[PDB]
């Protein structure tokens, strides 16, 4: 069975070089072409170029020529995509996809799983976790709202669970926002009953693997003058 297996996620500082790979399983390498697609965060797909291993022919979209190099090792059926100096704007997901030769009829019937590339000034940093306490101005009707502010971390991702997985209904963990620092920041919230607040304990479990930071934070209510 045909698989295109890509290399793992990358975090780099601007100006470093990077080479990501795509290994082809279950078909004869020289019989097809490998293509590279960029997909920047929250946007569409872009075709960067392609390599035909049978001929060593390499073709580029002109918007990428001279910023990246597509290559191949025939003996491992691997295609490469390479930058010599990264910019932060190269932050994106990169897919390889299989295609044909000039005049084929089927394109990108197979895709690798993608390689996320993050390019940034920032250095690895664990989050500070702050309570979003329930109160009276977080009391809808019989519905209260509480949560955790996971602030100032790098890179992505962090996970958040409530009551070591015991609490899952009403939970919203939002997309991180990148700060001018930055250093991402996100919040996880849950809606619970006003009455129970009271008698029930709420702790958020925050895991930032890149910095080997785990934190548990209790969210106790608050009293107003």
């Amino acid at each position: 069975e045909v698989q295109l297996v890509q290399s793992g996620a990358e975090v780099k500082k601007p100006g470093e070089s990077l080479k990501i790979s795509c290994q082809s399983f279950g078909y004869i390498f020289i019989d097809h072409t490998i293509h590279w697609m960029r997909q920047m965060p929250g946007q569409g797909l872009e075709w960067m170029g392609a390599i035909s291993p049978r001929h060593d022919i390499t073709k580029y979209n002109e918007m990428f020529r001279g910023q990246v190099t597509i290559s191949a090792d025939k003996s491992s059926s691997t295609a490469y995509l390479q930058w010599s100096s990264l910019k932060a704007s190269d932050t994106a997901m990169y897919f390889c996809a299989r295609g044909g030769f000039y005049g084929s009829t089927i394109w990108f019937d197979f895709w690798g799983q993608g390689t996320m590339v993050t390019v940034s000034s920032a250095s690895t940093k664990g989050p500070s976790v702050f309570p979003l306490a329930p109160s009276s101005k977080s009391t809808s009707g019989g519905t209260a709202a509480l949560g955790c502010l996971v602030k100032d971390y790098f890179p992505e991702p962090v996970t958040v669970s409530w009551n070591s997985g015991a609490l899952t209904s009403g939970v919203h963990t939002f997309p991180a926002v990148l700060q001018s620092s930055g250093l991402y920041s996100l919040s996880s919230v849950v809606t619970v009953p006003s009455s129970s607040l009271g008698t029930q304990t709420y702790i958020c479990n925050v895991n930032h693997k890149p910095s080997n930071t785990k934190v548990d934070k209790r969210v106790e209510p608050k009293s107003c003058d």
Binding site: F95, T143, L149, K151, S185
Partner: protein, 214 residues
Amino acid sequence: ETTVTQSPSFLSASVGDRVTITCITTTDIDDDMNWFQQEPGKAPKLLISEGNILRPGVPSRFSSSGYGTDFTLTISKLQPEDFATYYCLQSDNLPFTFGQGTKLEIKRTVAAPSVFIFPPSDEQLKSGTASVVCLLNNFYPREAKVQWKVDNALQSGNSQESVTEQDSKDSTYSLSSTLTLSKADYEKHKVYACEVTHQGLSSPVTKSFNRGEC
């Protein structure tokens, strides 16, 4: 390059509806038009090759049309699995160019947001930064405006927003807005308020608090 203009950028429909996306090339591309579906966190999956060839396994409800410049995908009997993003791709000449995509949202009835404001925690204040947070919970449709106000002064450039994906169960959205100040500016001012406007509210709702009050 052959430019491919896909439309609609976004689209709402109900399970069982019958939607159609269209892509227009700026150069002729005969029948060299392809269609992909992309679920989030996954790679694109091919649905239709050059000349409207349904790929082996693509369900009967998917279909394709066009020749020259104007091309259409058409999904009858929209099932739940089919809510995602769709892209078209011309394979007629280099560089390959994609449509900018179509995003498929479940249509449901209007729901007003539940709004909650959160003053900066005391732990955070002991480090010199204040983060005020405003939660808009479970609303539809997606459009919603947050206006932070500080002692009635409307704020700008002060905040960051983020929105969840559509909930699998209720098909609402939820929004978080964060107003970030230095601890110093925070203490300059008394009343901190979050003003939400949204089609499901006859008029804007405000949640407020007084610094110190709690």
